[PDB]
């Protein structure tokens, strides 16, 4: 949990031993300066199958999402922090985590998105191509 | 309603031998469908678990 948590409320991912469920490839060595692969969105921060915890299995691609949205923002410069980190429990019968995981990626979405349409405007862009 | 005619009169009754089945389908249906601000999944408020 206290990895899933560096994960969500930022694009960390200590992990020391390979053993968390997303994983991030050093894809920077073939696609840098020229982003050939647009890795980021690709193959850059991708999954692992057999290491998905079977709880959060209903949860597992909306985690890898919520992290990955952090990290182009977190590349560019633009300081991204989450508003509270709030620390997460294993439980039975209480998916308390369920609702937290959703607080947090609506944040994340929303930041990259409001970012977009006001810096590196895309509506603006879009119009002169 | 009954497993093959092999019905549990002790838990369904026979009664929610049929009212079990419809509300399961529905909650799942309408929920595959999308979460809806009145239930969106598990976001019910401490309905008690009872049963």
Redesign the interface.
Known sequence: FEVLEKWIYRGIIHDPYSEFMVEEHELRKERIQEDYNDKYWDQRYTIVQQQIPSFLQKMADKILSTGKYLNVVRECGHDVTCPVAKEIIYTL?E?AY??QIEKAFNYASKVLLDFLMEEKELVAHLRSI | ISKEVEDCVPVFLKHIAHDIYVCGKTINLLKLCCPRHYLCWSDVPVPRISV
Request: proline share 0%.
């Open positions: 019968k998916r369920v609702e």
